[PDB]
Nucleic acid binder design. Structure first.
Ligand SMILES: [Mg+2]
Ligand SMILES: [Mg+2]
Ligand SMILES: [Mg+2]
Ligand SMILES: [Mg+2]
Ligand SMILES: [Mg+2]
Ligand SMILES: [Mg+2]
Ligand SMILES: [Mg+2]
Ligand SMILES: [Mg+2]
Ligand SMILES: [Mg+2]
Ligand SMILES: [Mg+2]
Ligand SMILES: [Zn+2]
Lengths: 208, 86, 129, 128, 21, 104, 216
RNA sequence: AGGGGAUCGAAGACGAUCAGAUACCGUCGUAGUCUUAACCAUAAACUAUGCCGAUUAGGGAUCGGACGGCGUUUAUUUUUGACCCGUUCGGCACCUUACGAUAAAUCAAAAUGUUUGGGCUCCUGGGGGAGUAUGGUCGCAAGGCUGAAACUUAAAGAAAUUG
């Protein structure tokens, strides 16, 4: 406890919310660099991620988010259908820009494009499917935090959040909870114990 | 840095990588700075006081900067039982 | 076959340091290697080292912290007089201010700087900067 | 019969700028265009009105990718919030028996983290 | 063969500034 | 320059391989270098199936199959349009082509 | 010609004089993409063209000619850069080359051969670089001697502010542009070598981009 | 030098094509193609990449031996044999990636080399003349090994770009 008190232990509600969204199910391939965040692989089956280690590292990611002076410098990216609504809702509740769907490569390098931005931080849903964004992010010295499953590239990614990264409920739940911690760390919620008034299903996707 | 009679003569002094100790050259794109906020006793975020880390492009290119961050956080008491030696 | 365990050790250290490692493995251990390591330590270029002692030959584990540029070995042990010892420092050292060339003489092995104060010469075994 | 960009830019801008006051009838579009546009040719006037009335045929039956007329625009951010009464992830009410099922090493994580008091049942899974 | 406009450029400096007799 | 990693032969780890005869020009080529095609066909073409069926004396009948394995040299490979030239990047692709399973 | 409109955050901060000097920009290694930055802070930058060479390209009618220009910039007191750009006409090629040359300004590290008298005059170490069959060498030299180098690279070393150095070349040096790019890499690596005098730990500070607030 | 000699087929003889066709196409056909006892020692004899030793990144296949395990199948049936999962040793190989190397094609070596030294053996220095003349040596011969000079020339050559 050099730089953190004992109030940061996960609350009782969190663990059920996490294992109710099937966030502990991975793919067959196991990356070598994420081996430390792996206990063991199930006999004749998938790997299992530790949501307990997810909790503190996610809090640290929120602590990274709060450090930026104005929220408008944070940018969040998503391309797969499963994350457009969750990303836009996260952008609406906190302060951040969101890029959903096609990325239009050249956004951070060309100063004549319509979508020209000068962000200070990047949040990525999936390194594999948003690999192109990382490539230009590596040109102008911007850190990136990204959500990763058991198998995923780690190029130029300082912070990786181990999650299912492909489930319907897991991605939305993680994005909602991340918003919850950033607001908790600010003065909006005013208290750790009081519950938030928004329901988990808001950060989901609907077919039509 | 060099000196002759106690006065600095170098044009500038570069910084060093925290993970490996190599100096980060100018125009070395892919090297980033990480700022982590500091929380108080009741959970609020203290403004203006923070500890800064720097990572060079070489370690990012190899992809181990996440583990380096784990090492730095555990050394400065930011995380619990996330890194260990087998 | 193995013709220079010292060359193998320095090559492995140079590779690991260039790769950013913090610990290295050296399979064969000898008196020249062990006496080499404290010489490395006295200038701060390495950290702790541990040599586990199995009954065959022993091993070496030195701890690196960066801060090391290169460490090489001269394979033909030439004979150098005292008067031209500065030719070698002109040849394979970036500057005279720092860097050391290690010699072996009847009074133990030492760098070329303390060897000059001892006013002694001998055979060349390596260098580091 | 392939139309160039000159008609295309005007058709998208007119359609998105003035959606509700004008309808699927071509006769209306012909007389409406020149008060709200400056066009130097009658045949091009026919070109724009002719395609725009065909496009509204597809607007009446579903949506087209790349067009967001104002009426369509309001409804998406007005359907932004859809709220089911009971949370799908929640299982205290959704599942008749509140207690849920996990695997062995997941309960072992529960012991490791210290949250032993959660009531869950462990069932083995193995095929080999 | 870019030697046509070096007489009255004055917008750049050449290596061997051609001295005139 | 090397055009192919495998020398267009597929022989690494041995010194010699017995040759074979081309089915078209009677040339000699190494067995691993020749192109091999396995073919399964009917005794009669599909329009004649009914004629055989009603001309048989065994009520319902099942026509037997025919199995052949033809093998060609590379010179005969692209003159009969069995194989065709590919691009520089498309050369290094050894996956079998996806046969059409809907046929419009 | 007339007053410029900033497009990036740096342009507005420099225009308002909200940043102290160039050295923190070099320390934080931020990319530069707008040429008014260099000449607003660093006047009296001299530029110098090497030669101009035609380049051909065939077509049905015949051929078609392009022009390639070699330009480097420097102030003779520790800043240097070069740019390469081709165009159909010399005037456009030279002006755009001057722009990119200004965009490519780099600092150099000097030092004292042997004993120290102040007044930095030579390289700290020996450095060399290779770029596609061209190798260029820089060696520290005693005070007083002239430049021992080819006439092409003598201008670059003169404009780098270095007064004494020794040079050696190997490989196919016939490509002058490639030789110049190798020299620029050799001079660029002067700060990349970790000398023992940098062993003292330094203090990390927050960047101006994070701690300053831009205008609307 | 003996035995054997089905099939093809150097040499050779016919039939066509063509202005000519001593060839490509078709019918014959000697040596040879097989084997026993002895010579010859050259091949794009190619991975166009010498041998020994140390280090350097991820992955999944696969051949031989050993070790652990949940099951299925089956027999005068158990342990063995067949199949499945994980680790390790030794091989023939393959995919992605470059912190590295090269002029490039491309390479886990073609890396650890201008910051140049682990040990050992051989060969080349612009293109022709020329693997020729001559001497020596081995072989029944065909030939092998060693191997010049006079003279002549400002270009030959390698990788890649546009046509
Ligand atoms: Mg073999
Ligand atoms: Mg062979
Ligand atoms: Mg006979
Ligand atoms: Mg014939
Ligand atoms: Mg015959
Ligand atoms: Mg014979
Ligand atoms: Mg030969
Ligand atoms: Mg060989
Ligand atoms: Mg067994
Ligand atoms: Mg060619
Ligand atoms: Zn054939």
């Amino acid at each position: 406890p050099a730089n953190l008190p004992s109030i940061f232990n996960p609350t009782s509600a969190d663990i059920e919310q996490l294992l109710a969204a099937q966030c502990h199910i991975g793919s067959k391939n196991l990356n070598v660099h994420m081996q430390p965040y792996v206990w063991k692989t199930r006999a004749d089956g998938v790997n299992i991620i530790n949501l307990g280690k997810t909790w503190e590292k996610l809090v640290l990611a929120a602590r990274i988010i709060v450090a930026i002076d104005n929220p408008s410098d944070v940018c969040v990216i998503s391309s797969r259908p499963f994350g457009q609504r969750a990303v836009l809702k996260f952008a609406a509740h906190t302060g951040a820009q969101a890029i959903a769907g096609r990325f239009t490569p050249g956004s951070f390098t060309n100063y004549i494009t319509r979508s020209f931005k000068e962000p200070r931080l990047i949040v990525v849903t999936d390194p594999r499917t948003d690999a192109q964004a990382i490539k230009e992010a590596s040109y102008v010295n911007i850190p990136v935090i990204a959500l990763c499953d058991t198998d995923s590239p780690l190029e130029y990614v300082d912070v990786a959040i181990p999650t299912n990264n492909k489930g319907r409920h897991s991605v939305g739940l993680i994005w909602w909870m991340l918003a919850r911690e950033v607001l908790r760390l600010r003065g909006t919620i005013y208290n750790r114990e009081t519950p938030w008034d928004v329901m988990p299903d808001l950060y989901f996707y609907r077919d039509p | 840095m060099e000196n002759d009679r106690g006065e600095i003569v170098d044009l500038y002094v570069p910084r060093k990588c925290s993970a490996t100790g190599r100096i980060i050259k100018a125009k070395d794109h892919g090297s980033c700075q990480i700022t982590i906020a500091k929380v108080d006793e009741n959970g609020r975020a203290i403004q203006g006081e923070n500890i800064i880390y720097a990572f060079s492009g070489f370690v990012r290119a190899m992809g181990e900067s996440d583990d380096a961050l784990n090492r730095l956080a555990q050394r400065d008491g930011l995380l619990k039982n996330v890194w260990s030696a087998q | 076959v193995r013709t220079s365990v010292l060359h193998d050790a320095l090559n492995s250290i140079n590779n690991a340091e260039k790769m950013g490692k913090r610990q290295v493995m050296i399979r064969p251990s000898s008196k020249v290697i062990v006496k080499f390591l404290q010489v490395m330590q006295r200038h701060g270029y390495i950290g702790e080292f541990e040599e586990v002692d199995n009954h065959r030959s022993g091993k070496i584990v030195v701890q690196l912290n960066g801060r090391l540029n290169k460490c090489g070995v001269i394979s033909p042990r030439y004979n150098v007089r005292l008067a031209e010892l500065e030719k070698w420092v002109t040849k394979l050292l970036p500057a005279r201010q720092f860097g050391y060339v290690i010699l072996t003489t009847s009074a133990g092995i030492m760098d070329h700087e303390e060897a000059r104060r001892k006013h002694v010469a001998g055979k060349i075994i390596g260098f580091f900067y | 019969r392939v139309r160039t960009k000159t008609v295309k830019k005007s058709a998208k801008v007119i359609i998105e700028k003035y959606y509700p006051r004008l309808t699927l009838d071509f006769e209306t579009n012909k007389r409406v265009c020149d008060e709200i546009a400056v066009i130097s040719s009658k045949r091009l006037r026919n070109k724009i009105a002719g395609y725009t009335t065909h496009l509204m045929k597809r607007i009446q039956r579903g949506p087209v990718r790349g067009i967001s007329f104002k009426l369509q625009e309001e409804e998406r951010e007005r359907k932004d919030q859809y709220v089911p009464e009971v949370s799908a992830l929640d299982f205290h009410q959704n599942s008749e028996t509140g207690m849920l099922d996990i695997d062995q090493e997941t309960k072992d994580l529960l012991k490791h983290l210290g949250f032993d008091s959660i009531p869950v049942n462990v069932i083995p899974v193995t095929q080999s | 063969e870019g030697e046509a406009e070096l007489k009255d450029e004055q917008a750049a400096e050449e290596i061997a500034q051609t001295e005139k007799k | 320059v090397k055009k192919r990693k495998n020398n267009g032969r597929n022989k690494k780890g041995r010194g010699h391989v017995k040759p074979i005869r081309c089915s078209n020009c009677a040339r000699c080529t190494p067995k691993d270098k020749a192109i091999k095609r396995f073919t399964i066909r009917n005794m009669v073409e599909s329009a004649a199936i009914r004629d055989i069926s009603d001309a048989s004396v065994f009520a319902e009948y099942t026509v037997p199959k025919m199995y052949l394995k033809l093998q060609y040299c590379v010179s005969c490979a692209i003159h009969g349009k069995i194989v065709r030239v590919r691009s520089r990047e498309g050369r290094r692709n050894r996956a079998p082509p996806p046969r059409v399973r809907y046929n419009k | 010609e007339k007053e410029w409109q900033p497009v990036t955050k740096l342009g507005r901060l420099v225009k308002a004089g909200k940043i102290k000097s160039m050295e923190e920009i070099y320390l934080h290694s931020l990319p530069i993409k707008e040429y008014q930055i260099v000449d607003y802070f660093l006047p009296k930058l001299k530029d110098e063209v090497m030669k101009i060479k035609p380049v051909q390209k065939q077509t049905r009618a015949g051929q078609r000619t392009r022009f390639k220009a070699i330009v480097l910039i420097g102030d003779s007191d520790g800043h240097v850069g070069l740019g390469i750009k081709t165009s159909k006409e010399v005037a456009t090629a030279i002006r755009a080359a001057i722009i990119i040359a200004k965009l490519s300004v780099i600092p150099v590290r000097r030092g004292y051969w042997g004993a120290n008298l102040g007044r930095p005059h030579s390289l700290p170490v020996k450095q060399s670089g290779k770029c596609g069959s061209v190798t260029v060498r820089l060696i520290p030299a005693p005070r007083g001697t002239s430049l021992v180098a080819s006439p092409a690279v003598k201008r670059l070393l003169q404009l780098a502010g270095i007064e004494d150095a020794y040079t050696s070349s190997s490989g196919s040096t016939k490509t002058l542009e490639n030789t110049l790019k190798a020299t620029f890499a050799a001079v660029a690596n002067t700060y990349g070598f970790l000398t023992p005098n940098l062993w003292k730990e330094t203090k990390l500070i927050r960047s101006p981009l994070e701690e300053y607030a831009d205008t609307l």
